């Protein structure tokens, strides 16, 4: 680590090295500063409307709310002990505060206790078969509380159906039983066996943050602070979650109003539209 002569001795593994040229290491320009670039979307997102929410729907009619123009501050949500299990697969439970999504969906529904494992990519069961199934490659995190204290004959589930339903699909039907219209075949939906008077048989409420990482204009970012933009200086830049080292030069490319960013053959982002100044 002293001088290139010693570096050559080290890479040759000999105190006396022969005359010649030898590759020892790679010259990398270290980032001199750190640039943070995020849009002016300071509108805070009402995550309380789904976590501190007093109302929740059942699994047979699970409501979905598109989330846009938000600020995702996962700090207090992650630090709160209200989450009995926080199993994130496409993202990390601790690396939530710095990511920024373009658009995400919030689903709220109720499930039993033994079926907690069924809310995961690549799972089966009564609900994952006939009521509600997740994508085999779902990216995001599953939020399930010890709702035994929080969460009564009004929670429904399906028993018989033709086949499995596509992920995130909503199927609502209150008739046409499998085999046994007003005949033995009747109402194919039964309620859960819960009651305010009633561990594994106790209800556990589940919320899923389906994080859609599709390329789009960013709407929901974490609580990060933007910095001044420097040019012709390799720094640790962050353009809506895209990090790396490089220079930011004024390009002459004519982006179309819908096209957000460009790419090269290497599938790497070649150009980025600054979200604050277009």
């Amino acid at each position, epitope marked *: 680590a002293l001088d290139p002569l010693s570096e050559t001795k080290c890479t040759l593994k000999s105190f006396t090295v022969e005359k010649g040229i030898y590759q020892t290491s790679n010259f990398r320009v270290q980032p001199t500063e750190s640039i943070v670039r995020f849009p002016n979307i300071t509108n805070l997102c009402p995550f309380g409307e789904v976590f501190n929410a*007093t*109302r929740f729907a*059942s699994v047979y009619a699970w409501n979905r709310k598109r989330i846009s123009n938000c600020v995702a501050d996962y700090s207090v949500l992650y630090n709160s002990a209200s989450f009995s299990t926080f199993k994130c697969y496409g993202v990390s439970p601790t690396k939530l505060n710095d990511l920024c999504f373009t658009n995400v969906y919030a689903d709220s529904f109720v499930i039993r206790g033994d079926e907690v494992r069924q809310i995961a990519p690549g799972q089966t069961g009564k609900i994952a078969d006939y009521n509600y199934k997740l994508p085999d490659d779902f990216t995001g995190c599953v939020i399930a509380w010890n709702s035994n204290n*929080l*969460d*009564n*004959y*009004n929670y*429904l589930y399906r028993l018989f159906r033709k086949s499995n339903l596509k992920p995130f699909e909503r199927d609502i039907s*209150t008739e046409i039983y499998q085999a046994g219209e007003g005949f033995n075949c009747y*109402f194919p*939906l*039964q*309620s859960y066996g819960f*009651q*305010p*008077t009633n561990v594994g048989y106790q209800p556990y409420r589940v919320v899923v943050l389906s994080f859609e990482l599709l390329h789009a204009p960013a709407t929901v970012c974490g609580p990060k602070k933007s910095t001044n933009l420097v040019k012709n200086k390799c720094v640790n830049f962050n353009f809506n979650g895209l990090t790396g080292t490089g220079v930011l030069t004024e390009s002459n490319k004519k982006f179309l109003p819908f096209q957000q960013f460009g790419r090269d053959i290497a599938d790497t982002t070649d150009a980025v539209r600054d979200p604050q100044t277009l």
Partner: antibody
Amino acid sequence: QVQLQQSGAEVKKPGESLKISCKGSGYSFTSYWIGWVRQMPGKGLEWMGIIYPGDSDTRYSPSFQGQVTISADKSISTAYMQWSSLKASDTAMYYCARSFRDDPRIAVAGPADAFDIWGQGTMVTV
Amino acid sequence: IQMTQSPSTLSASVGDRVTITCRASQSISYWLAWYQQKPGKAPKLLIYQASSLESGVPSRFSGSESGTEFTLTISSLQPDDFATYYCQQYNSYPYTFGQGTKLEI
């Protein structure tokens, strides 16, 4: 026309027994949960006791153990509140209570609320 | 988590908006039903499950909730709104009721 055909007013004295009715007409009486709420004259209502008439599942309130034997008759549709020793404190307008139905009525049909529709009221005057 | 209802009496006129409270007796966040009782007849639901309107009652009678302190609100008073009302919770057994309110000219 879902109607809890509750019995008329009874005028008796303490000590004997009483058989009151809360009859279903135009629907299935087993569907709606029959909650027993007591409303004393001049004041509001009060939950006095509960029984599940489906299988005679009876839960006597602690202040009513041994003195009141609440039951149910499904044949002629008379939901019972039998005071084996009638009490002058129980003189009140008794409203047998139905359950609400707003989400998946056919699924539960019970324990959704304590007031859907009440009859003319069985005024038990002891 | 204590049950306190207000007021003892409410004096107003037609067209007035009033706001009273039925503070939660315990953790009753999910299941609470609001009842409307006229003098001499059986009560009727105002807001069951604390978020749903009931059938048969005009829209001028409404109820709200805020943490441990809930609300019963009349937006537009009418000459026939001079009566007594009670609020009730049904989240946990047993169930409790309210106190009442009287209006005078």
